[PDB]
Amino acid sequence: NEYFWDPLPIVDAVVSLTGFALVGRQDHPRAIESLKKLNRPYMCALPLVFQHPIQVALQIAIPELDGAIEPIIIALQDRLEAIAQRAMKWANLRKKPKLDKKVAITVFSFPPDTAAYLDVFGSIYEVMKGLQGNGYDVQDLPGSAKELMEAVIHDAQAQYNSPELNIAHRMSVEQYERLTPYSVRLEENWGKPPGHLNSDGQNLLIYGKEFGNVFIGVQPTFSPHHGFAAYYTYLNHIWKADAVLHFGTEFGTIPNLYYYAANNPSEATIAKRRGYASTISYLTPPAENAGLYKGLQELNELIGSYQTLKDSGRGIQIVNTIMDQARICNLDQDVNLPDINAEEMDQGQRDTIVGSVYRKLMEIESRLLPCGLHVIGQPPSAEEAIATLVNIASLDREDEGIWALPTLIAESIGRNMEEIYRNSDKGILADVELLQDITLATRAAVAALVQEQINADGRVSFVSKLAPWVKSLCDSGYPNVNEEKLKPLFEYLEFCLEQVCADNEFGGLLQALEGEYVLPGPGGDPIRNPNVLPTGKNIHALDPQSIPTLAAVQSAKVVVDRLLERQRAENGGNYPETIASVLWGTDNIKTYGESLAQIMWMVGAKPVPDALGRVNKIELVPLEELGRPRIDVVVNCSGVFRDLFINQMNLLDQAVKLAAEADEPLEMNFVRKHALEQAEEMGIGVREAATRIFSNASGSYSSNVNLAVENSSWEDESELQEMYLKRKSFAFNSDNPGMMDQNRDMFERALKTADATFQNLDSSEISLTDVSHYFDSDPTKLISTLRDDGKAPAAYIADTTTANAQVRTLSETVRLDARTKLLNPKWYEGMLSHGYEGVRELSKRLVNTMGWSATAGAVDNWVYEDANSTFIKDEEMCKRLMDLNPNSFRRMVSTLLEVNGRGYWETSDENLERLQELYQEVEDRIEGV
Amino acid sequence: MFTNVKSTIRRVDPEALNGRQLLKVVYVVLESQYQSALSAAVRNINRTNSSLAIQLTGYLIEELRDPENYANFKHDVSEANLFIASLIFIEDLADKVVEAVTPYRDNLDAAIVFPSMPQVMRLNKMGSFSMAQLGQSKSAIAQFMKKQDAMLKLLRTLPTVLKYLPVEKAQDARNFMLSFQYWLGGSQENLENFLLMLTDKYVYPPDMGIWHPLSMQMFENVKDYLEWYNQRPDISEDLKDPLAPCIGLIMQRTHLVTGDDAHYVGMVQELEAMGARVICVFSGGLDFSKPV
Fold first, then answer.
1. Are the beta carbons of A663 and B46 separated by less than 8 Å?
2. Separation between Cα atoms, residue A155 and residue A926, nearest integer Å
3. How far apart (Å, rounded) are the C-alpha atoms in residues A734 and A752?
C-alpha cells in the first residue's frame, strides 16, 4: 500500500516470492480489499521452487485464496526466465492498446467423437460480441452462434458434404521444427513430422478461423502428437496471441484464462497449478425439478386417487393396480413389491406399500438438476432461479443464524423434520404425504417472494424488509410459522436471488484482459454455499487444514451408521469387515470433508484441530464410543484428491495404523484382524501390513479405465481390471511421506477382503452418468475377480446434497440418473433445444452408462432398451438427432451396439439390425462414400 | 480396554535416517496416555523434521517384571541419549531401574524423572542440575513424594530454588522446570517441544504481550492475564487484592522464545515472595513504550 503507489499505482503487475498469504491466522478479506485497490495481476511463486510433498500442498493453497496466478508448476535459468516472461506478458496486457490486443480462444474436441454444461459456440459468440462492444478489433463477427460454428466446422451437420475443419494455416516441417525446439522429443513415438494427424502429407494443419484480432482455434485431439504442439506454436510464435482463453471441458508464456464451472473448484485448482491458469467462474444452468412423465406420471395419478378411494371404502383393488404400474416402471428394483394381492394384506402394510412407491416417485420428481447448457453472460431470469432458491431455503445455516423454511413449517406442528425424513424413508404413508405437503408449501412461499420482487420492479432495494410468503404459508395450511425467524431467511433468499441473477461473467474476462486483478471467491455448490455466487471470479478450493469441520464429522457418523445398517440388513446382520471407498477433492471441498470424515469414523478415529483451528492430528476413539467394531478400509484417493489433500491421506494412514496396533480383540477391530493375518503371510510388521491408503503414482491421474471405455479399445474386463491394479496401487506412507512406492501385493490383499464398495455423489449436476471419473475409480467387479469366493461386493453411493441424507445402492443411483437425465423428456428436450452440442450431452450419459456395465454391472437392461426406444425406434427423434449432429449420433449408436456386442444389453435381432444400418447411414454422411 | 485405547507397540523407529542425526530415548511410565503421546510425538518428528530422527523404546513399569523385557531395557539404557521415568511407585522395579541407569549416568546427555519413589528421582541429571541442588526444598518434596498434586508441588517449588544457584546451574534447573511443564501439558506438540528442547540444549547444539513463568500461554491483554492470576491457587489472596503492591517488569521476547529466562523467572518469584503482584511485558521490537 506504501511502495506500489505514491494517487496511482506505479506497478503493472506484482510477483510475491514470500510464498505466504499477503496478510497473516491468515486474513484474506483485508488482502483482497488491498489487491482490488492496486487492481493489478497478483502472481505468487513458492520459495521451495528455488531449492516435502505435504508442506508444498499446505503452502500453495494459501496464495490461491488471495487470487494468485502461479507462473511455476539444474540451473535457475528455467524458473527465473519463466516467472520473468509471464510477468512481462501480464504487464504487456496494460501497455498494449485495446485495438492491437490479439485474443486466441481455444476449443477442445470438435467435432465430438467434465460436466461443463457449456454451450461452447453459444458462449464464444457472446464473448466475441462483448469484445467488439468494448473496442477490440473483431472483424466479420458472424450473424449467430450457428454461423460462427459454420465458419469453423464447415457443414458440421453433414447435410451436403463431410463436416471438415476450416484450416487457419498450413505449417511446413521447416517452420514447425525451427519454432518448436522440443519437436524432436515427440518424434520417439509419432516419428518424422508431419505424421498421420492434422497432416495433408507435407504440412501440419492449424484448425480455426481468424476474425481480425480474435482467433477461434480448434484442437480436436491430444507425449502429444506434432499437430497438438503445432497448434500452440501457431498461437505463441506466429499468430502471436497476447492472451488465450480455454473452456474447462487435459494435461507458453502468454496469460492463460479458463472459464470453469463455479461447481468445479478441484479441477479449476489443478489448472491454476498445471497450466499457469486464472480460472474465471460461470454458473451451471438454473436447475429444474426433474418432474414426472409417461408411466411415472400415470402412477403419481393412481396414488393421488388412493386417499379418495379409502373415503369410498374401496381402497383395496387400487393398491393391486398401483403395484402393477410400479412394476412396469421397474420401481420393483427400488421398492420391495412382494407378489401378494392387496386384499390378502392388512391396513398397515397396504399404506406402507404406497408410501414406499410414492417416496421413490417424489425422489424422482424433486431431484434438482440442470436440463440444458449455459451461455457465458446469459444469466438465469428470476423465474428460472426459484427451484435453486427452494433448496437454498431447505438447509439450516448456523453461520447465517437462520433455519431452513421446512424446519419452521414442521416446528409449527410440533414436528422434528429429521423424524419426518426417516419416517418418509420407512414408507409410512402419513409422513410421505406430510413431507410432499411441506415441500409444496416451501416451493410456493419462495415462489411468492420471487413473484413479489418481479413487479416491485427494482423500486425498493430489498422487497423482504417492507407479506405474500406468510400468505402462501397460510393458504398452504401452516399459519403459526414463527415470523421472527421468517424475516432473516427471506432477507437471505432475496440476497441469494440477486447473486444467482448477477451478470459478472463477461466482466471477469474483461478485467483479466485489461491486466486488472480478478476478484477471487470460493468454488463449490451454490445451494450448499451461496457465497460461490455471484460467478465471474478466480475461484479457489480451500485451506486443506480447515477440514473436516465438527459439522462434517457429525454428518459423517450419520452416513456411516446408515451405510452399516443397510449392509447388515442385506447380509444376515453381520457388519462388513472391509469397505473399499473412493475419495474425490470435489465433494470434500463442497461438504468441508464429510466423505473424508466417514472413512475416519469407519476405523473409529476423530480429527483433532489445534489451538488455531488447523486439523493436523488424529486419534482413535475407544470402542465404548464407537459402539461397534473398527471396520477395515481400502481408500482409493483420486490424483486430484492427492494433489490438494495429501495432508488428509497422511491423517487417514496414521488412523488406520493406530487401529491395527490397538490392543483390542480381533472380533472388535477388523483392521487389526486383517493386518495380523496379512503381516504373517507377507512376512512383515502389523503396521506395514496395515497399508490401506492408495492413489495414482505422483504426477498421474485416473485408472485409465475412462480412456479405454471412451475408445472402445479393450477386449475383456480383465484388461480394465489389470491396468487399475497397475496404476492405482501406489501406497501413501505417513512414516515416509515422500516415498509413495507401488505396492500391488498389498492393494490386492486389502481389496480381496472388501465386502462393499462406496463413493459420495458430488452433486445432482456432477452425478454418476454426467462424468466418467466415478466409474474409472470403481473397484466393484475387480473385487469379485480377486476374492477366492468370487462374490461381488455390495456397491453403495451416499448422497448428502439435500437435508435428507440417502445411502443408495450403485444400482438405485444409476437408475435415478437414467430416470432424471437420459430417459427424462424434460432433461433430453432441454438439451436438444440447444441443437448440435445438445446431442453431445446425450451420448455422454450413454457412454458413462456403458462404463458402469464394465466396472460394476450396475446397469438394468431396461435402461439400454428405453434409450434405444426413445432415441432410435422413434424414426422422428432418430432422423432429428442425426440431422442435428452426426458425430454425437454415430457415438450414441456405437454405444448401444457395443453394450449388446459385449453382453450388457439383450434386445431383439430387429433393434440390432436398425442400429447396424443407422451406423452405416451416418458413417457415409461423416466420411463420404 | 473398552474405555481406554491402548497400543501393542512399545518401540517407534524412524523408517529411514537419510542425512539426519539419531536421538535415542528410553522411557519407563505407568500411564498408557503418556506412552502413546510420546509415540505420536516421536512419530510426527520422524515424518516432518529433516535434520533429526528419534528412536523410542519403553515399557510400562509392570513389564520390567519379566526378564525378557528387563534385559532389552538394560541394553536400550546403554545406547540412550535421553532416559525418561514418571509415576514409578513400586519398591521392586524402582531398584531394577536404578541398577540399569546408574552406570550410564555419565553416558546420558540427560535423565528426566518426574514424581517417582526417591531412589529413582535421584537419577535426575540435566547438565549441572540434579535433585541435590534444591537448596533446602530437596527435603520438602523428597518426603511429599514418599507419600497430580505432587506434580504441581515440585513445579511451584522450582522457581524458589533458582536464586540460590549460579546462572548456568539455574538455567539447567529452569530447563528441567520447562520440561516438567511440557510433560504436565501432555499434548502431542507439548511432548514434541519437550524432545526438541532437550535435543537442542543437551544432545546436538506474538509481537508483544504479558508473560508469567507458571502460565503455558502468553496473554495479549491485561483482562485475560489478571483473570488467570486471580484463579491461581499457589499464591496468597494478599496478591489478588487490588491494593497489593504491583511491579511491572520489561523484558525481550528473545529470551522467552529461547527458554533462556532463568533470571526473569527468579525475579518474578522474588517479587511474589515479597507480596507483589507482577506484570511482565515483553516485545520482539525495540519500542517498549507499546507494551508499557
1. no
2. 10
3. 23
Q: Spell out which residues of chain B touch residue A654, defining contact as CB-CB under 8 Å.
A: 43
Fill in the DSSP letter of residue B104: G
Place of cell 492413489: A695
User: B17: which chain A residues are within 8 Å (Cβ-Cβ)?
Assistant: none
List residues bridging with B27 in a β-sheet.
Answer: B58, B84
Touching check for B71 and chain A: CB below 8 Å?
Answer: no
Q: Which of A685, A538, A560 is nearest to A621 (CA)?
A: A560
CB contact B18 to A (< 8 Å): no
CA A686, CA A661: separation in Å to the nearest integer? 7
Cross-chain residue pair B9–A661, CB shorter than 8 Å: yes
Residue A482 dihedral angles phi and psi, to the nearest 5°: -40, 110
CB within 8 Å: A663 and B7: yes
Between the alpha carbon of residue B34 and those of residues A617, A791, B28, B59, B203, the distances in Å are: 16, 44, 10, 11, 22
Of A54, A619, A663, the CB nearest to B8: A663
CA distance A408 to A412: 6
Residue B192 CB partners (closer than 8 Å, separation 6+): B41, B44, B45
Beta bridge partners of A210: A215
Question: B47 and A662: CB-CB below 8 Å?
Answer: no
B6·A662 Cβ contact <8 A = yes
Q: Is residue A706 within 8 Å of residue A772, measured between CB atoms? A: yes
Using a 10 angstrom Cβ sphere, with 0-12 exposed, 13-18 middle and 19 or more buried, the burial of residue A596 is buried
Interface test with B, best of A612, A663, A691 (most B CBs within 10 A): A663
**Resolution attained, angstroms:** 2.5
Paired with A244 in beta bridges are A104, A256
DSSP category for residue A526: T
| B83 and B26 Cβ atoms separated by less than 8 Å | yes
**Between helices A505-514 and A120-132, what is the axis angle to 10°?**
60
* Residue A25 identity: R
Report how far residue A314's alpha carbon sits from residue A324's, in angstroms, rounded to the nearest whole number: 18
Cβ-defined contact of B3 to A734 (cutoff 8 Å): no
A with B: how many residue pairs have Cβ under 8 Å apart?
45
Helix axes B138-146, B149-162, angle to 10 degrees: 170
CA of B21 vs chain A CAs: smallest distance (Å): 16
Question: What is the spatial distance between Cα A320 and Cα A343, in angstroms, rounded to a whole number?
Answer: 9
**Residue A562 · residue A807 · CB < 8 Å:** yes
How far lies B255's CA from each of B160, B165, B180, B258, in Å? Answer: 20, 19, 19, 5
Residue B14 with chain A: CB contacts under 8 Å: 735
Grid cell digits, residue A779:
473397484
Give the residue among A500, A313, A465, A314 at the shortest CA–CA distance from A392: A500
- In chain A, the residue whose alpha carbon lies closest to the alpha carbon of B190 is A610
CB within 8 Å: B15 and A736: yes
CB contact A741 to B (< 8 Å): no
Partners of B46 on chain A (C-beta within 8 Å) are 735
Query: Where is A925: in which H helix or E strand?
Result: helix A909-927
Across the interface, whether the CB atoms of A662 and B7 are under 8 A apart is answered yes
Distance CA A103, CA A526 (A): 30
Question: Among A625, A661, A667, which would you mutate to test the B interface (most chain B Cβ atoms within 10 Å of its Cβ)?
Answer: A661
Asked whether the CA dihedral B265, B266, B269, B270 is positive or negative, the reply is negative
Residue A734 and residue B47: Cβ atoms within 8 Å?
yes
Short-list A836, A832, A847, CA closest to A897: A847
Alpha-helical segments (H) within A667-772: 670-682, 686-689, 705-710, 717-727, 744-751
C-alpha cell at B18: 537419510
DSSP B135: T
- State how far the Cα of A333 lies from the Cα of A860, in Å rounded to an integer: 9
